[PDB]
Symmetry: C4
Subunit: 31 residues, 4 copies
């Protein structure tokens, strides 16, 4: 179903936290 889709999208909106913070890991190794 639709609710077990919305509750994947809200896994992606975790991966796009852990995307951003583990880029900002790299950026704060570089400047």
């Amino acid at each position: 179903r639709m609710k077990x889709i919305e509750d994947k999208l809200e896994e992606i909106x975790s991966k796009x936290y852990h995307x951003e913070n583990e880029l900002a890991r790299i950026k704060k190794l570089l400047x």
Copy 2:
């Protein structure tokens, strides 16, 4: 619902802007 799914997908299509520009942050630190 379907419209509150399409309006997550259009959050992901923000994260995949902030993905691209904060890679291009790193690429422009490196070359």
Copy 3:
């Protein structure tokens, strides 16, 4: 709708090409 959702998902499956190749930009600047 459902088809104009599947045809966002197949934008994300472009961003997750341009994700991979513009990481592999950075990896090939580094090793």
Copy 4:
């Protein structure tokens, strides 16, 4: 359809593995 959407989302939840591990490629080149 809905099942051929859930089975894109579970492609994205592969890309967000290959996201994480090919960042952690870069992080382990840098520290």
